[PDB]
């Protein structure tokens, strides 16, 4: 109910002063107003790192000072137990001891006996701490362009990105969540550079009248400490006119990009207050764009600060989803970092659950309900893929208290009480399972009842906030899992605790071997299907559910399920649909018009099998039908889920020409965008099986012929095929699938190669007002998908033939596009990213030799994030395939030494995803000194961020995981 934490807190005043750009330091004093709880509270603990305190003071009395860092290395630096398990357990216990959720110590000021007698008299105190941040090595960021003479004034900015508990790294506090406080914030800033944090503009004139300004932001609204961040430097734009109080802060020469970017946000506010039945529960809302991003999502109190990658300036069409997608994320996680709050790390999952569900509801009534279901399919793809890679993602209410583990989910790391042990794969699937558990709450409880629940939560939050700090009656904003469950059961009490003990408290992905049997094939038994499941390693036995069957022309049959899963079950049978030449359309689904006796329609009243088409269960369903039923699903079905799962099932085995015909019929209608992308991939995989069975034409030429008429297109489609984004996505996708069309003689895509060359010839001027960039990028990706691995028979790598014959033309085109984007550049060098992927594929086919020096020169510092991340993916795969130890040493040294966090994040991420030095396959000899240097990089040099040593924990998961590394 209540927090197990003494020393309640009310007020805190920050005052940043003397912020430097040359020695790059910060000095400041912080002010805490504290009501202690119990007597003999002598060793009062706060917590921070990289903070040299100048002095501490309580009412003109400098007391004692304790400053420890057990977040650093093991207490013996040469602890020979250099394995995963001992380091994981010792680090979990050590950083739990860093956490003040016990009698612990990181910053323990000792109360003297005089002030102890004062605590015996009055438990009301004030804390004044003068301190100084150095050159910030994990707590702030000083983005400075390398000029330093004049453009350090105009062109640089100062901010703080970080994780949830990164407030420790910036200014000293408690465990930085779950301390409902109020703040006064004093900012010694430049006259041009504007400081952006929480609260309100409560005292701002040209302040202190000497040379600079000083900002007073007061946060009276009670939040936690894990919401404060200070962006200094950008320029003010009000993009108000619809709701009059939305403020934005961005760097100069980026301002009409904001004038296009911000709008449609008022619609998101309108829909969120249709959901919540309130107002926006603040004064105003702030947004800062910045050329760095620890997290792309990041959402704080009345303020969203994230990357200058999401502008999307009116011509750059393929961020039409992404921009307001990330804005919806940075409003939802905003709303649930503001008021509703966890009591512990194990109690969080409700928050990001309801936030992801709220921006999913936003994705419902803004764009693409079928794309919304496709996003749910991508969520299931992510969850099934990761929890078949690794174990489950469990949502604990249960602790390991009493030095206990209780962790079957400890295949790698600790998960119960602590954030900074987890991986971003685990964190992403935490959010993904939060999405789908909220969809299970949809599946058992009505949406209107959820609106009632959420209105009750925000009613208790807004009533408990903005008051005179009611003593002992103020922690109602801690709305964690237990009381939230009680509120749901008060609204509608059902079997939601079985839903918890299934999906919240048993982290398992469930496959489904629902074996199709065929009764009423003029049979004695009537329409029966067997249920079966067993697949251990990561399995789960889920019982009572329902099953959806569509008839030929008839009812949605729904059938119960049972536990003890060696089962046989029935169907609420259709009539005997006989004389079906007369029974043409007896109401299939409304007024849909379809006629085929082409199936096995002698004695078959069934068409399709389905288990929960609204996608309740974390599922991977495996079964078999007749192939005619699968192909008849792809002429029309009212589920994009059914369409793309039949697309996968018909990507596996078949090759008739009627499949190609029905695929081309499905691709020429108004059905869906990405269904046709994966259907062109069906055409690719099936025409790859047309080596000896080349019955049709060379495919997908007639699809460009019969669908696109500019001026009737005399054999060639050239100009101005836009303003219909169906054709935009389709022309973006299809030549990539055309480049896969291969029959095995030399795989011979020569007509397709020349056709793609002719398409690259025929680009448009400014008649298209749509910045023809991604079309070029995916055609270069089709050139990358022109993999020809079998040219170098003996030695043709090293400028022998000036290698021949079409590879040289592809080199000409990628040279042209690289130098055009060196001269033109149009939007982020995305063409250069596709070209570098093409150059790596050519290095993987032995045409351009395996040399990292181009990728080395594009992994340098002063480039864009995407260029650098593509070159780093390239050099990670280079270290995987080739035996380059020296570039791995440089890669680890740049993991140690660079100021950008996200490139380190993604180096570690896709170094874990694409590993060299593979466990129990050790030919390049990691045992020599690489185990030692990786152990050092886990211990030392990684006190900057938590996630970098989390990625290093992922590295030792991949590299020599549950054993000694076979050194000694």
């Amino acid at each position: 109910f209540e927090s197990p934490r003494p020393y309640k807190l009310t007020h805190q005043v920050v005052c940043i002063n003397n912020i430097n750009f040359q020695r790059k330091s910060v000095v400041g004093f912080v002010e805490l107003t504290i009501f202690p709880t119990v007597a003999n509270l002598n060793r009062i603990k706060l917590n921070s790192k990289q903070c040299r305190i100048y002095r501490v003071r309580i009412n003109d009395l400098e007391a004692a000072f304790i400053y420890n860092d057990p977040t650093l290395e093991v207490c013996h630096s040469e602890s020979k137990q250099r394995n995963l398990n001992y380091f994981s357990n010792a680090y979990a216990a050590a950083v739990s001891a860093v956490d003040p959720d016990a009698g612990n110590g990181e910053l323990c000021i000792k109360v003297p006996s005089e002030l102890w007698k004062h605590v015996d008299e009055l438990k009301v105190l004030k804390i004044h701490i003068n301190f100084s941040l150095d050159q910030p090595k994990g707590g702030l960021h000083f983005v400075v362009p390398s000029v330093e003479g004049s453009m350090a004034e105009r062109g640089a900015h100062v901010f703080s990105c970080g994780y949830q508990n990164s407030t420790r790294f910036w200014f000293p506090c408690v465990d930085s969540y779950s301390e409902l406080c109020t703040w006064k914030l004093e900012f010694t800033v430049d006259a041009a550079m504007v400081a952006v944090s929480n609260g309100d503009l409560v005292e701002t004139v040209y302040t202190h009248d000497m040379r600079k300004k000083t900002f007073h932001y007061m946060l009276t609204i009670p939040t936690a400490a894990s919401n404060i961040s200070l962006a200094i430097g950008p320029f003010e734009i009000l993009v108000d006119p619809y709701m009059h109080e939305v403020t934005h802060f961005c760097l100069p020469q980026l301002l009409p990009l904001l004038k296009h970017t911000t709008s449609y946000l008022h619609e998101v506010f309108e829909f969120y207050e249709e959901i919540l039945t309130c107002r926006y529960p603040y004064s105003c809302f702030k947004t800062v764009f910045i050329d760095e991003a620890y997290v792309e999502v990041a959402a704080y109190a009345s303020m969203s600060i994230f990357s200058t990658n999401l502008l999307h300036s009116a011509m750059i069409i393929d961020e039409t989803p992404l921009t307001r997608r990330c804005l919806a994320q940075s409003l939802a996680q905003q709303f649930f970092g503001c008021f509703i709050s966890r009591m512990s790390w194990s109690d969080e999952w409700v928050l990001k659950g309801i936030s992801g569900y709220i921006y999913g509801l936003w994705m419902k009534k803004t764009f693409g309900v079928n794309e919304y279901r496709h996003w749910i399919k991508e969520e299931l793809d992510k969850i099934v893929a990761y929890e078949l890679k690794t174990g489950g993602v469990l949502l604990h209410p249960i602790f390991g208290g009493g030095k206990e583990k209780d962790n079957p989910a400890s295949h790698l790391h600790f998960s119960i009480k602590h954030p900074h042990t987890l991986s971003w794969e685990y964190y992403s699937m935490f959010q993904c399972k939060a999405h789908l558990v909220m969809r299970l709450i949809e599946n058992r409880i009505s949406m209107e009842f959820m609106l009632q629940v959420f209105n009750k939560l925000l009613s208790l939050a807004s009533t408990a906030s903005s008051q005179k700090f009611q003593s002992h009656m103020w922690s109602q904003m801690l709305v964690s899992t237990s009381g939230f469950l009680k509120s749901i059961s008060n609204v509608s009490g059902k079997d939601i605790q079985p839903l918890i003990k299934q999906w919240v408290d048993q982290s398992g992905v469930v496959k489904f071997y629902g074996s199709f049997a065929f009764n009423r094939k003029r049979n004695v038994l009537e329409l029966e299907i067997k249920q079966d499941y067993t697949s251990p390693g990561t399995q789960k036995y889920v019982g009572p559910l329902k099953v959806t069957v569509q008839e030929l022309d008839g009812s949605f049959n729904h059938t119960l399920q049972i536990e003890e899963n060696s089962l046989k079950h029935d169907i609420p049978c259709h009539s005997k649909s006989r004389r079906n030449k007369k029974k043409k359309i007896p109401l299939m689904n409304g007024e849909e018009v379809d006629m085929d006796l082409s199936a096995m329609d002698a004695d078959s009243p069934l068409l399709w099998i389905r288990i929960d088409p609204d996608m309740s269960v974390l599922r991977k369903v495996e079964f078999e039908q007749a192939d005619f039923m699968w192909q008849y699903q792809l002429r029309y079905e009212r589920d994009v889920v059914a369409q793309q799962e039949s697309i996968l099932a018909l990507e596996k085995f078949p090759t008739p020409a009627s499949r190609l015909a029905l695929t081309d019929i499905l691709e020429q209608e108004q059905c869906f965008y990405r269904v046709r992308m994966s259907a062109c991939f069906c055409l690719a995989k099936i025409a790859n099986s047309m080596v000896s069975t080349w019955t049709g034409p060379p495919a997908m030429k007639s699809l460009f012929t019969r669908m696109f008429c500019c001026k009737s297109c005399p054999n060639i489609v050239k100009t101005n095929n836009f303003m219909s984004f169906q054709s935009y996505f389709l022309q973006k996708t299809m030549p990539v699938a055309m480049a896969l069309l291969r029959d095995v003689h030399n795989l011979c895509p020569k007509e397709v190669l020349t056709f793609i060359l002719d398409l690259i010839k025929y680009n448009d001027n400014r008649k298209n007002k749509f910045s023809d960039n991604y079309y070029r990028a995916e055609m270069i990706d089709a050139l990358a998908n022109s993999v020809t691995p079998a040219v170098s028979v003996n030695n043709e790598v090293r400028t022998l033939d000036n290698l021949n014959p079409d590879v040289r033309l592809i080199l000409e085109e990628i040279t042209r596009f690289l130098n055009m984007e060196k001269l033109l550049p149009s939007y982020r060098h995305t063409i250069t990213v596709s070209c570098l992927r093409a150059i790596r594929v050519l290095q993987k086919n032995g045409h351009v030799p395996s040399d990292p020096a181009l990728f080395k020169s594009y992994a340098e510092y002063g480039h864009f994030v995407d260029i650098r991340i593509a070159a780093l993916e390239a050099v990670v795969d280079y270290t995987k395939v080739d035996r380059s130890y020296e570039e791995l040493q440089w890669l680890l040294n740049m993991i140690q030494n660079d100021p950008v966090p996200y490139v380190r994040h993604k180096i570690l991420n896709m170094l874990t995803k694409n590993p060299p030095f593979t466990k129990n396959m050790e030919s390049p000899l990691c045992n020599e000194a690489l185990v030692d240097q990786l152990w050092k990089l886990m211990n030392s040099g990684t006190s900057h961020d938590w996630r970098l040593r989390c990625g290093a924990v992922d590295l030792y998961f991949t590299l020599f995981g549950l054993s000694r590394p076979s050194c000694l």
Binding site: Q253, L818, S857
Partner: peptide, 22 residues
């Protein structure tokens, strides 16, 4: 020098004002 003399990397100070300019 004859066939494919690709332009080497510049890397310069401020990437976001250049690579995000219409």
């Amino acid at each position: 020098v004859s066939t494919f003399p690709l332009i080497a990397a510049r890397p310069f100070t401020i990437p976001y004002l250049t690579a995000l300019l219409p």
